[PDB]
Symmetry: C3
Subunit: 31 residues, 3 copies
């Protein structure tokens, strides 16, 4: 378990970093 | 202690999914 | 081992809260409601 857990955490971290990029972008497109 | 950890993870998963949906609709609305 | 995991899970929930606020303000900005 703990092993997968960490692995799933690394995955999550990457998911987030993508989303922040979408957001950063979207912000340029608006106000 | 471990089960808590796990509940935490499903939580993070559900919300991320929510967020990816919002972002979708926001694009639609501001674009094609 | 277990603590480090917990520490990182809280860091994640923090980040995630912040993005949800970002979203809220964007939604406002374009009139989503």
């Amino acid at each position: 378990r703990m092993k997968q857990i960490e692995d799933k955490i690394e995955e999550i971290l990457s998911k987030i970093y993508h989303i922040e990029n979408e957001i950063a972008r979207i912000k340029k497109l608006i106000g």
